[model samples]
Target: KLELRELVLLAMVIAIKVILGQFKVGNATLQVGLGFIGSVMLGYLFGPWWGFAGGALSDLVSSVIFGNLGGFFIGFTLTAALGPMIYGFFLYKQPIQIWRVIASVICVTVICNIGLNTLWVSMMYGINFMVALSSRILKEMITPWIQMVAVWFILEGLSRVKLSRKFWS
Candidate 1:
């Protein structure tokens, strides 16, 4: 059952992700989007389905708009969809703890950055698997910390405002 607020939030997050994709930093593309933040918040608020929907929709729309219909886009959607499930397993029905959020961000970042991105890049570019893996890892290491920090702050602020409660209630 999707509520109006949930739909609105999904649209907002999608728009934000699209906007963030435009803001490239250096040679490494660092997307400091609201995808993770929205996923975690939606998971805690409306459970796994809503979280998955929010994240997946955002990824799909952003990818389409950005003209990135590559393996990386599919990898991103997969990661986004899986993120809510991971959060539900570890952090559902619990208070949002800083360490737990940090751990979740790190876990998701590694899985997406190293696991999925490496495989996708290797398949797409026919590069050495090891080199792709290393580059992806390096790229993730460079900007993911900043992303995690931003997500943590956003989640914390959302929790403090009782936003999740509003959605859940």
Candidate 2:
């Protein structure tokens, strides 16, 4: 029972995600590019499946837009897939709380992004797991705190919007 407005919001989130997802942050960057903001937002609006859909599509679309950086791997899709389920499980249908925010972001970053993605990237590209893990460890470890803060503020802001209220269920 998806509504037209919800579909439109999904499209907008896909655009936001694909565009932001193409590049890494830090020294190299684009306007507000990178991170899981869009994915988290989509999860907040919809539930797990559509959130997974948005994530997988964004991965595909970003590769198309930015070139086949890693040449299409199904494993990366799996990396993106659990994000919304992680975000939604803690944050959805509940009053966005401090503990839930911290827990979900950690799950998404530690287990999903760092743990699964490192393994997938290693297998897909033939990099050693320890090497890949070492390279990504710093960023992945630090980013969750940043994400929880951003998600907190974003959720706090969105909590006040009337239309936003309608979609959370």
**Residue lDDT tens for model 1, 1-169:** 7778777866775566456556644443554444555566656655666666766776787677776556444666776666765555445677767777777777767766567767777877889889898776665676667756776676667667665565454
State each model's CA lDDT, in order.
0.65, 0.75
Q: RMSD to native for every prediction?
A: 3.8, 3.1
Candidate 2 residue spans exceeding 4 A from truth:
22-33, 162-169
TM-score quality measure for candidate 1: 0.72
lDDT of 2 by residue, 42-118 (tens): 67767777888877777777777776466678777767767876776777667878998889889888878789989
Using all chains and alpha carbons, the TM-scores for the candidates as numbered come to: 0.72, 0.83
